[PDB]
Amino acid sequence: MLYDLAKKRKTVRRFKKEKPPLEDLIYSLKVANEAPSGMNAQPWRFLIVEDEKLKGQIRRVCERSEKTFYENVRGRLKEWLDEKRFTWRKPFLKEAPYLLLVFSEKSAPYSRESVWLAVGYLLLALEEKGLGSVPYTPPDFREVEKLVNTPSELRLEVILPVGYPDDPKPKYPRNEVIVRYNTF
Amino acid sequence: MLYDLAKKRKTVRRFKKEKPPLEDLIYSLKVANEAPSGMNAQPWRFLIVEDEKLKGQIRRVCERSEKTFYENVRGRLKEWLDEKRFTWRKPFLKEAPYLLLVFSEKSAPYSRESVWLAVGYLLLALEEKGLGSVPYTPPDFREVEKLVNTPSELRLEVILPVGYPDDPKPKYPRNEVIVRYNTF
Ligand SMILES: Cc1cc2nc3c(=O)[nH]c(=O)nc-3n(C[C@H](O)[C@H](O)[C@H](O)COP(=O)(O)O)c2cc1C
Ligand SMILES: Cc1cc2nc3c(=O)[nH]c(=O)nc-3n(C[C@H](O)[C@H](O)[C@H](O)COP(=O)(O)O)c2cc1C
Ligand SMILES: N[C@@H](Cc1ccc(O)c(I)c1)C(=O)O
Ligand SMILES: N[C@@H](Cc1ccc(O)c(I)c1)C(=O)O
Ligand SMILES: [Cl-]
Ligand SMILES: [Cl-]
Ligand SMILES: [Cl-]
Numbered sequence: 118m119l120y121d122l123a124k125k126r127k128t129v130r131r132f133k134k135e136k137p138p139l140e141d142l143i144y145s146l147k148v149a150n151e152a153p154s155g156m157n158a159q160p161w162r163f164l165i166v167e168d169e170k171l172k173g174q175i176r177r178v179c180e181r182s183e184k185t186f187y188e189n190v191r192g193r194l195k196e197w198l199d200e201k202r203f204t205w206r207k208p209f210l211k212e213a214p215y216l217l218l219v220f221s222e223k224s225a226p227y228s229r230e231s232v233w234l235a236v237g238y239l240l241l242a243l244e245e246k247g248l249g250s251v252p253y254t255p256p257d258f259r260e261v262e263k264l265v266n267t268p269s270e271l272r273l274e275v276i277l278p279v280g281y282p283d284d285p286k287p288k289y290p291r292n293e294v295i296v297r298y299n300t301f
Numbered sequence: 302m303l304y305d306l307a308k309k310r311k312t313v314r315r316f317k318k319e320k321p322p323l324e325d326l327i328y329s330l331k332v333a334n335e336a337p338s339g340m341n342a343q344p345w346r347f348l349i350v351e352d353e354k355l356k357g358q359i360r361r362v363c364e365r366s367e368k369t370f371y372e373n374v375r376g377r378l379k380e381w382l383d384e385k386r387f388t389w390r391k392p393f394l395k396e397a398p399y400l401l402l403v404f405s406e407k408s409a410p411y412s413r414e415s416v417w418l419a420v421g422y423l424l425l426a427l428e429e430k431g432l433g434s435v436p437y438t439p440p441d442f443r444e445v446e447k448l449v450n451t452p453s454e455l456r457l458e459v460i461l462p463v464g465y466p467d468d469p470k471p472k473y474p475r476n477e478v479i480v481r482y483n484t485f
């Protein structure tokens with residue numbers, strides 16, 4: 118049942134050392150590629166980063182940006198990150214066997230909406246295949262974009278470390294859906 | 302496999318009048334609600350429109366805005382709309398038994414990304430239940446927002462007509478997924 122896949126999927130920020138077969142990632146990209154999109158533009162592009170030096174570069178730029186973010190963060194965001202024990206450290210950016218970078222085509226109508234919709238598909242497909250992921254959004258996308266020679270027509274949306282999950286922390290709660298009818 | 306569900310799912314712009322059980326629609330919201338989100342804020346909000354008067358108001362406000370849009374659109378979207386023989390009339394906004402209005406909580410971090418990801422889950426769940434949908438995005442959400450007394454805290458992201466498909470048109474093609482390694 119799809120609800121079972123969705124309910125069981127949780128963030129994974131800690132991965133096994135072993136590298137999953139690329140076929141599993143490709144499968145999940147093929148699932149995502151079946152998603153709808155504005156104008157059927159299919160505005161998602163994928164970059165699979167496996168090179169260890171490059172992952173380390175990405176980790177370093179993101180951690181340097183997170184350090185500044187964590188120094189400055191305030192209020193609700195700070196409290197949430199503190200209560201979940203987040204810090205600027207992002208070891209998974211180096212340790213995950215794959216970094217799946219997801220880009221949107223700037224010129225496509227509803228490109229960013231469509232790519233995030235497709236990311237929904239992608240995440241469920243990774244769960245189906247027994248892989249873990251976290252949608253990681255660093256403070257400064259441009260620095261990561263430059264590291265991988267991103268063309269001007271593309272926009273990095275999210276970094277998805279992918280790998281075999283390793284002793285994940287539990288899924289956070291979900292409040293029940295409360296619907297409204299006709300009008301607020 | 303999830304791939305088969307994703308491959309099968311296509312736009313539905315032709316609906317039966319027959320009303321699906323509410324639980325079939327609620328199921329899809331329950332699946333979507335299991336999705337990840339920025340800071341686990343669960344920033345989606347659902348408004349189920351069924352009242353025929355209100356559906357008509359929404360339809361006419363959207364059609365007016367579309368008619369102006371179709372008079373003025375140019376470039377690639379105009380070319381695609383023309384070759385698909387799209388027009389500004391939106392009968393599915395009356396014919397669908399449900400208009401599911403999906404909102405994002407503006408104050409939540411990565412609210413829009415998170416809601417569109419959940420919409421990806423939602424569309425797959427609707428397909429699992431044999432329901433059809435189209436992510437309808439009219440040119441002027443503000444007028445629709447006002448019609449349903451949207452609070453200032455929420456942004457209407459998409460109108461999802463939901464119903465039983467009435468022999469919908471075939472799925473459009475998909476280019477092969479575009480996957481690169483390490484750098485562009
Ligand atoms: C973000 C987004 C916005 C969309 N907006 C509209 C819309 O305003 N009107 C419409 O008829 N279809 C809309 N669609 C549906 C697309 O036209 C459709 O997903 C695309 O043609 C692929 O259809 P297929 O899956 O049947 O091949 C939208 C889809 C997405 C993802
Ligand atoms: C748009 C978006 C951005 C996210 N950004 C980050 C991030 O920058 N760092 C991180 O650790 N997790 C990030 N997450 C993961 C969320 O914190 C996670 O989905 C949420 O805590 C719920 O986790 P659960 O499904 O395991 O309960 C992001 C999630 C989404 C949807
Ligand atoms: N909203 C208009 C035009 C339109 C149509 C399809 C589509 O994928 C996109 I993005 C826009 C209409 O519904 O006709
Ligand atoms: N990017 C920072 C903060 C962060 C964390 C979780 C999250 O859901 C969101 I949105 C932001 C970090 O990765 O620590
Ligand atoms: Cl997550
Ligand atoms: Cl097409
Ligand atoms: Cl669609």
Ligand SMILES: [Cl-]
Nearest residue numbers: 289290340341
């Ligand atoms: Cl939480």
Ligand SMILES: [Cl-]
Nearest residue numbers: 407412413456
């Ligand atoms: Cl917003």
Ligand SMILES: [Cl-]
Nearest residue numbers: 314315469470
């Ligand atoms: Cl149709």
